[PDB]
Symmetry: C3
């Protein structure tokens, strides 16, 4: 008949880029950022990791290398052997997230698998030492280190644990990722 | 002046079909499925029921007959004496629910009466023995056995208790209802 | 590229009118209602207040006078010295809030500052002595006494504490405010 109001479009372009992270010693989410095979995630996920294992929604499974992390922003960067065509998380550094914007929270809890929740940008600004993004989309261990995107699928932030949920603005998460790629 | 974003349309066509269920010995929700007077609900609602009483939003009140239930899917089917014109829950078996679709949860808790909550389809797939639908719309005893419909009002599922809520896909709930109408 | 689904418009026209309320003896939210400088809030906020202090999002800070309150509806009315141009909360007394309508909850918790959450009108009707509005938007002490507006920004209600949140219909809140301006 007609067309149901839906944010499925955003799911198809963003969700395949979000990933499951495992420990395989003798669990959380992550986000493929670029073709080079760099993935963002959370420290509390990969701490004391023995072997890091990444699993995509297309069925591919890799062993990840821990590039570097940042206790301050709780973020961590992994590195997998990028092969032929990787799903990457849509990014627009020219986009200015506005408060009230619709956002989808994407994460693959070890229980249910990939789960999309819906809310809006509740607030932004600074609250710490040196920048956060608040949202009423459910944000727990199940989707921590996951993506947070607008109705267009553009990456707004990386779900974090710093009725209200938090994310790290994609603009900051980028900078942090880039610096962690440093190799003194 | 202008027109507020609203999913009221879906409410007008679906909500009148959702019903209050009572015990009247010496409480939950249900859904009128067809003109014949068949209503879907939950087992944990009608278990050990003495007299089942159905109440519509138009003010009509019937005594319901328990056709049959299914402990596996927690569903149950009731039967009331369908009179002149019943409100039935819109159904489209040609509709494929997509993840991210907007959905409304409809249920009449014994406290507040009919209550509509809003979310999206978080996830689908299988997780049990032989099929579920996950959503971030509030789903509790207040709306259990209630309807879950898209922005068009089309039935997506039957609220169940198997920050995340669950429903039984309308495609499966149909089959289950049909089989329960069996009378060895 | 394109335009993200967003209720930011409603934020820009309504949010500047919502206010922080402080005690400054030796905390909650409020809503500027009219140019005269009348502000609505909650009793449990200004009870036993020594000095009431109002703070706008534009940086202006006033000392408020308690006009009057109402234990029944938990509302309270303050009065600040309206100067040149005040931000007032959009009001449409010709608008009929429908169930399913999108609504934004606006409040400035003492912790995070102004926070917008999103939901819909779950239910209305009466439930008390002499009229409420239910919604699945988060409603806590952080946004109590705050505004609740539709996607157009029009005031629907005043967040109250009477998974479900409550507000006082703007039509009633108006009448109550007007009567409290009485001075026997």
């Amino acid at each position: 008949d007609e067309t149901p109001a839906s944010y499925n479009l955003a799911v198809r372009r963003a969700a395949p880029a979000v990933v499951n992270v495992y420990n395989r010693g003798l669990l959380g989410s992550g986000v493929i950022m670029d073709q080079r095979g760099y993935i963002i995630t959370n420290k509390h996920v990969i701490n004391d990791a023995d072997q890091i294992i990444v699993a995509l929604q297309d069925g591919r499974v890799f062993e990840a290398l821990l590039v570097g992390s940042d206790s301050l922003t709780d973020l961590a960067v992994l590195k997998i052997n990028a092969t032929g065509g990787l799903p990457t998380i849509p990014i627009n550094a020219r986009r200015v997230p506005h408060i009230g914007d619709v956002v989808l929270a994407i994460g693959n809890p070890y229980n249910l698998g990939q789960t999309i929740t819906q809310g809006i940008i509740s607030a932004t600004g600074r609250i710490g030492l040196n920048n956060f993004l608040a949202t009423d989309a459910s944000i727990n261990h199940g989707n921590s280190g996951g993506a947070l995107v607008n109705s267009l699928g553009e990456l707004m932030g990386i779900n974090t644990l710093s009725g209200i949920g938090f994310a790290i603005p994609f603009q900051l998460a980028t900078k942090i990722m880039d610096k962690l790629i440093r190799d003194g």
